[PDB]
Amino acid sequence: GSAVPFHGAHQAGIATPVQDRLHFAAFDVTTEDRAAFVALLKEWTAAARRLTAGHAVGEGAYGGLPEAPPDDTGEALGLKPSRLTLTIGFGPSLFTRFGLADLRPEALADLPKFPGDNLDRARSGGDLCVQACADDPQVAVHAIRNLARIGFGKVVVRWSQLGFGKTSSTTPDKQTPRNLLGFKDGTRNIAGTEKDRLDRFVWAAEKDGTPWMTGGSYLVARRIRMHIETWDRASLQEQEDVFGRDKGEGAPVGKAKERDEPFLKAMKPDAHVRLAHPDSNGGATLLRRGYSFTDGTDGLGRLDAGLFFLAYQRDIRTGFVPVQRNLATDALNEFIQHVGSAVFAVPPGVRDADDWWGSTLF
Amino acid sequence: GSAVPFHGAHQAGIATPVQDRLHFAAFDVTTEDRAAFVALLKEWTAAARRLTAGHAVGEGAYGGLPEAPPDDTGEALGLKPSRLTLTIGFGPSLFTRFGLADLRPEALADLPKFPGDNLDRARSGGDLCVQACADDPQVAVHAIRNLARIGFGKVVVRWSQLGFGKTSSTTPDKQTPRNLLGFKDGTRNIAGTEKDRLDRFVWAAEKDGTPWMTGGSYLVARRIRMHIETWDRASLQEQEDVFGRDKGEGAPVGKAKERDEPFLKAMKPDAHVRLAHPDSNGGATLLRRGYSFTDGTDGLGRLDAGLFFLAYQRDIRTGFVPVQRNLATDALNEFIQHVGSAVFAVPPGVRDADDWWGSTLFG
Ligand code: HEM
Ligand code: HEM
Numbered sequence: 001g002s003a004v005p006f007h008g009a010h011q012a013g014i015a016t017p018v019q020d021r022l023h024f025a026a027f028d029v030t031t032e033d034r035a036a037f038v039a040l041l042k043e044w045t046a047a048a049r050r051l052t053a054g055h056a057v058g059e060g061a062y063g064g065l066p067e068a069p070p071d072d073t074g075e076a077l078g079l080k081p082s083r084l085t086l087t088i089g090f091g092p093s094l095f096t097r098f099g100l101a102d103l104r105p106e107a108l109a110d111l112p113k114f115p116g117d118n119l120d121r122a123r124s125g126g127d128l129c130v131q132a133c134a135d136d137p138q139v140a141v142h143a144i145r146n147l148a149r150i151g152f153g154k155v156v157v158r159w160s161q162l163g164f165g166k167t168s169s170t171t172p173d174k175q176t177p178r179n180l181l182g183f184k185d186g187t188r189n190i191a192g193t194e195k196d197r198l199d200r201f202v203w204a205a206e207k208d209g210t211p212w213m214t215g216g217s218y219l220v221a222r223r224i225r226m227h228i229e230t231w232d233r234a235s236l237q238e239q240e241d242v243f244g245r246d247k248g249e250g251a252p253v254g255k256a257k258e259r260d261e262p263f264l265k266a267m268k269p270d271a272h273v274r275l276a277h278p279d280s281n282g283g284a285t286l287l288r289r290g291y292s293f294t295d296g297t298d299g300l301g302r303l304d305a306g307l308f309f310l311a312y313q314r315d316i317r318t319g320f321v322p323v324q325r326n327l328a329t330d331a332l333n334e335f336i337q338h339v340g341s342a343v344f345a346v347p348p349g350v351r352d353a354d355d356w357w358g359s360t361l362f
Numbered sequence: 363g364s365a366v367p368f369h370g371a372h373q374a375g376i377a378t379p380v381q382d383r384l385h386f387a388a389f390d391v392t393t394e395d396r397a398a399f400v401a402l403l404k405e406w407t408a409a410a411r412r413l414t415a416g417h418a419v420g421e422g423a424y425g426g427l428p429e430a431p432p433d434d435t436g437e438a439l440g441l442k443p444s445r446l447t448l449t450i451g452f453g454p455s456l457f458t459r460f461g462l463a464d465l466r467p468e469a470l471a472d473l474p475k476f477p478g479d480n481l482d483r484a485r486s487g488g489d490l491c492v493q494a495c496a497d498d499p500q501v502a503v504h505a506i507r508n509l510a511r512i513g514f515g516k517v518v519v520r521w522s523q524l525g526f527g528k529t530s531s532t533t534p535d536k537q538t539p540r541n542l543l544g545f546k547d548g549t550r551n552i553a554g555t556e557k558d559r560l561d562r563f564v565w566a567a568e569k570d571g572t573p574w575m576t577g578g579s580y581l582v583a584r585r586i587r588m589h590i591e592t593w594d595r596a597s598l599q600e601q602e603d604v605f606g607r608d609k610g611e612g613a614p615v616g617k618a619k620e621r622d623e624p625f626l627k628a629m630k631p632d633a634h635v636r637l638a639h640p641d642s643n644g645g646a647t648l649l650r651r652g653y654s655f656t657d658g659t660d661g662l663g664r665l666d667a668g669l670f671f672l673a674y675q676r677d678i679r680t681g682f683v684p685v686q687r688n689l690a691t692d693a694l695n696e697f698i699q700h701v702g703s704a705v706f707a708v709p710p711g712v713r714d715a716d717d718w719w720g721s722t723l724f725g
């Protein structure tokens with residue numbers, strides 16, 4: 001239940017080992033006062049320092065003046081830091097405010113429309129996001145809930161997604177988690193230890209064209225419904241054919257071990273791994289960091305379940321966009337549907353205790 | 363602990379230690395065939411035996427005939443039993459089927475309308491329920507998902523609730539968990555160790571008037587929204603006055619320790635503990651076993667937080683109903699709203715590997 005350092009050239013929550021649980025919130029800004037928004041970012045940064053150390057925000061959750069509401073709502077008392085990370089991003093829509101228009105990064109591209117999209121606009125977009133990842137779901141919910149409260153009057157919660165289990169890995173030496181289709185998910189990703197690959201594929205560089213984004217990254221979120229009724233009636237072979245790996249061990253078809261390298265020509269041409277592989281996409285590589293969800297029932301007698309997909313990359317135009325375009329013929333398409341979407345510019349890290357979220361932009 | 367025994371005179375998941383996470387599903391029955399429903403109960407019991415031992419259902423999640431769908435959907439492979447318990451209950455509407463109307467227990471009382479109810483009927487009721495509790499939410503979700511799959515064609519999922527963190531205790535010797543209002547919740551409950559209180563307040567007895575229910579219990583579920591923005595703008599003193607305990611230690615007003623017994627007169631007369639206490643309700647006592655939830659946002663820019671309240675008792679008429687009736691004036695009502703409700707008759711335990719869920723009811 002240890003604590004992930006909050007400061008760094010890069011924000012935590014990206015290369016960091018993937019924590020077991022997720023609370024993701026998109027916010028919309030309701031103030032048009034740049035000074036007030038800057039003040040919010042500083043307050044938020046200070047609260048995140050405490051929250052990620054497992055401490056209450058401000059003066060605490062109790063023991064203050066009886067006539068004052070407590071600084072912290074208290075539901076994380078007695079819990080551990082739980083490897084909490086808090087990662088902020090800025091949406092394209094934010095750059096219509098605070099005189100920021102000319103600072104929107106080129107690499108923060110709006111996505112094209114994709115075949116089979118059914119995007120719920122109310123569960124899409126957002127002026128900004130906060131990604132809360134922790135091994136304890138209540139540590140994550142508490143962070144989001146208290147950030148929202150601190151921002152009362154200046155921002156609102158547009159949409160929020162709980163992820164009950166991870167479907168990603170930045171630690172290939174560790175057990176790979178499974179998604180709700182029963183397959184290991186995260187085998188061939190990017191590790192936090194592969195500093196070279198993160199520099200190449202994840203972190204924006206000064207020369208890419210947006211100096212304030214140096215050391216940040218670009219994030220794509222996709223809420224993906226899974227047609228579990230359809231999947232659960234499919235034979236084992238069909239499921240294995242869909243991905244290009246076997247279900248039990250997770251090894252590429254033909255091979256014996258999960259982490260044996262794919263031999264792509266042995267997979268079906270519409271196999272998910274074959275279409276998504278960097279070698280099929282001009283080298284394009286993603287840091288996938290998604291989680292599973294279930295939100296009630298569909299009103300039709302079935303659980304509503306899916307995968308809240310997250311992908312970090314140096315440039316949306318060289319990462320998610322080409323790979324997703326190449327999944328147009330993916331056999332997995334028969335079993336999923338994209339029903340929410342948003343993109344964000346994730347600024348560089350909080351350098352020290354004097355720095356604050358977004359300082360390079362503001 | 364890593365696992366909880368599935369067999370017993372009682373179903374596990376009631377008096378046993380409260381696990382960290384919840385997946386609760388209410389099902390509606392679609393078949394009119396009693397034998398086929400009995401077949402489902404047997405299949406389900408077999409699956410629960412495996413699931414609660416951390417094993418896949420049926421022949422497993424892979425390694426079968428490549429042309430056959432796997433028996434288990436696989437998302438619990440490599441996970442642990444995680445103290446998983448699976449607890450089944452039977453709703454009033456179940457007894458309108460399979461020629462059972464005269465076997466519905468009197469202690470399975472319908473709830474009355476309560477002041478302030480705003481019940482979503484689609485997230486209320488149900489012919490039956492399965493309570494899945496485990497420390498790992500994926501283990502719980504996997505159990506519900508495979509039970510629903512196994513049952514398809516004979517049952518559908520009416521509504522389902524994820525509980526991301528507990529707000530109850532049956533083990534006072536460990537730390538008491540906090541709810542989304544920031545208060546310890548579970549301090550004065552019924553412990554697994556209190557055999558006599560469980561017999562008095564939780565387990566149905568043969569003499570109560572429904573012999574097949576001997577050893578079972580009766581379950582009330584309430585989905586309670588929390589008006590969290592309003593709560594967080596109230597002063598610490600107002601919050602503590604709402605409950606009658608202080609927020610930090612959870613001690614009754616005027617006392618120093620969480621588990622000091624309350625002095626109720628020192629609380630505001632509309633304080634939640636004072637109104638809910640057995641001494642204010644003719645001795646009526648509950649075994650609370652609920653969890654917190656968040657399900658997205660309201661329409662309006664604010665999280666949709668709340669408490670998925672669960673209460674086990676020997677007779678709904680002498681448990682939840684009187685206590686909830688007394689919360690009509692609760693100061694807590696300013697900050698909550700009941701938006702979902704169901705009741706269920708939870709049968710006695712699966713005695714051995716030959717037994718099955720509901721066997722005392724169906725024969
Ligand atoms: C519900 C939706 C999805 C499911 C269930 C899923 C599942 C999987 C599985 C089982 C693997 C193989 C193990 C692994 O390498 O992680 C995989 C690999 C991968 N997936 Fe997905 N995926 C989904 C959506 C996506 C999307 C939307 C993208 C990008 C637009 C994507 C990109 C990738 C990539 C790049 C790999 C690695 C392939 C390699 O380099 O070997 N996936 N996914
Ligand atoms: C969001 C809804 C609720 C919240 C936040 C809440 C919170 C609390 C808290 C903080 C306590 C004191 C700690 C403890 O002893 O557990 C408590 C006690 C209690 N609550 Fe609730 N409660 C809620 C709903 C209910 C409902 C609906 C009932 C019954 C109908 C109920 C019955 C009780 C009882 C019986 C006690 C213990 C009384 C005693 O000390 O003997 N609660 N509750």
Ligand SMILES: [O]
Nearest residue numbers: 185186276288
């Ligand atoms: O993926």
Ligand SMILES: [O]
Nearest residue numbers: 547548638650
């Ligand atoms: O409670």
